[PDB]
Design a protein around this ligand. Structure first.
Ligand SMILES: [Fe+3]
Ligand SMILES: [Fe+3]
Ligand SMILES: [Fe+3]
Ligand SMILES: [Fe+3]
Lengths: 339, 339
């Protein structure tokens, strides 16, 4: 029942963000929510290409790094490339079929596109610092630690796409699939969406910000400066991306957009809190892997775990969740100059 | 069975364009088909924003147009906005779930994104020349003539998405859906893809080029020059877009990518020819609507129909179809300076 051009002339100003009539005409003279129009415009204004950044000195730095410092740098880079491999495609495959207002439709496609630039920038970095990029790229899919995070993150998107496919084909109700019982509930699909957005918000607002700290710690030592300039550009995009999911999550939560979402968001409250806590703990456990073979000037397991708690508290509050950790000051204030 | 990060470490250089393992890692150090990497790079190099173009004189021109010339201009603009409303979303929703090589995945997301810029540029034009843009935007969905083309074009995408949803959930075979028979065939889904790409190629390579002729005919009269500058930028993107579908269609046809596609493409040959002929006839009938109330200097029903035949022959040949019309010279050679 999904359609790439819905024939009904609907008032797009009254549609909900999600699960309404698929957007027919893409117009930009008006918005229900102008934050999405402001995010499009800002992301457009930021357009950059990786090749605009000189990464030619980073091979020298990378080779001069002690082996455990190479391990810190490349593990971090591998994790970023994993995450924006998912982010390049997943907003488009998972969110587009559900969007019912043009400004959010176009924001999501602009968001995903900006992720492909990030993915291309990671390739630009990798091929300029290692001799065999395939070894790096292949380790991303087979790395025991990396593959752990990939599973959980992608499952939020996959479960949403699968249930979407059932809902578009069958609609709500209980159905027969080769003698199996399939209960299709829009309330449940709305739950899958809200949890997915919560997971995506933790991804961009916490998981990538932990990784930014690792990259900029090298830059603080005047090393891997080409990488650091690219990460500055990525982080500036990332701030737009998390603002997007913050607004989607809060507009759903308030009931201003879908009153059914407000009560779903309350039912999901503990499960949202738990998923944020788990992601923060997973990033703490990732720090044990990053520093498995030793630490470096300005960054170690303890410092980075403090930063996880610091940033997690900020992000959870902004989407209305209680704080899981003691309130603390920024343990790495030097990171602010890069952001 | 669709996954946003497939866990198997596969050789992406050996995957097919479509229906293979979904792309896990987005890497750009290598390509199976470097045309898609070249298209990404070129489209990135072309990045433009509508607001970079001064459209401030076009309101004066538009108001000075006789009523039938306003009708020609705005009907053409309405049709373009319809078509790139579909093109902004549909490559992402319809093609992304099926792509199994990273360079094609990223090309498709870059292609769709560049379409949203076109859609935003049409909004930029509309709001600068009419007093009530809503009347324009609403007529796009309700216009009897426009809605006719929207139905057929969107059906190629919708049928492909629906069958995709059955294939990811159920896989190949015959299944029970509430006591109904559903035969899911990958060969059939491959047929839906190939016909869709043929339809999309006619869309961008013929239907939009007919509309470019209308826009540039005004520019030839030194009218609507702001519009014309935007259409120049759009047409330059369009040439990349049709090159993309040309290569997908030809690589599938050759069997170089999927040997099963080569025999499917032969079985589909007459039906591909017929769909191109129908689109050309539909564009000829659209010219009767554009010039319903009279013609203008340099462009009329007869001239535009000659251009339909001229351009249709070129596009059909490039994707290996026989020519439906007598071979003729460019009836509007002035269009070349704008392209
Ligand atoms: Fe990113
Ligand atoms: Fe992001
Ligand atoms: Fe376009
Ligand atoms: Fe196009």
């Amino acid at each position: 029942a999904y359609t790439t051009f819905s024939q009904t002339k609907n008032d797009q100003l009254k549609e909900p963000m999600f699960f309404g009539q698929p957007v027919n005409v893409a117009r930009y003279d008006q918005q229900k929510y102008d934050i999405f129009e402001k995010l499009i415009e800002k992301q457009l204004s930021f357009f950059w290409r990786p090749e605009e950044v000189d990464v030619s000195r980073d091979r020298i730095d990378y080779q001069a790094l002690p082996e455990h410092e190479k391990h810190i740098f490349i593990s971090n880079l591998k994790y970023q490339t994993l995450l924006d491999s998912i982010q390049g495609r997943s907003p488009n495959v998972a969110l587009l079929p559900l969007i019912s207002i043009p400004e959010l439709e176009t924001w999501v496609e602009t968001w995903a596109f900006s992720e492909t630039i990030h993915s291309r920038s990671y390739t630009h970095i990798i091929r300029n610092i290692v001799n065999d990029p395939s070894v790096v790229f292949d380790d991303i899919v087979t790395n025991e630690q990396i593959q752990k995070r990939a599973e959980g993150i992608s499952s939020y998107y996959d479960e949403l796409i699968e249930m979407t496919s059932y809902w578009h084909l069958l609609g709500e109700g209980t159905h027969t699939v080769n003698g199996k019982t399939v209960t299709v509930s829009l309330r449940e699909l709305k739950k899958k969406l809200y949890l997915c957005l919560m997971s995506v918000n933790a991804l961009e607002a916490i998981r990538f910000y932990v990784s930014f700290a690792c990259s900029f710690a090298f830059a603080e030592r005047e090393l891997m400066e080409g990488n650091a300039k690219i990460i500055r550009l990525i982080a500036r995009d990332e701030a737009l991306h998390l603002t997007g999911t913050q607004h989607m999550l809060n507009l759903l939560r308030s009931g201003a957009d879908d009153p059914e979402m407000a009560e779903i968001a309350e039912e999901c409250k503990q499960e949202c809190y738990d998923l944020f806590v788990q992601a923060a703990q997973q990033e703490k456990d990732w720090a044990d892997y990053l520093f498995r073979d030793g630490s470096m000037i300005g960054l170690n397991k303890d410092i980075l775990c403090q930063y996880v708690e610091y940033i997690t508290n900020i992000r959870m509050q902004a989407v209305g969740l209680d704080l899981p950790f003691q309130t603390r000051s920024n343990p790495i204030p030097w990171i602010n100059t890069w952001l």
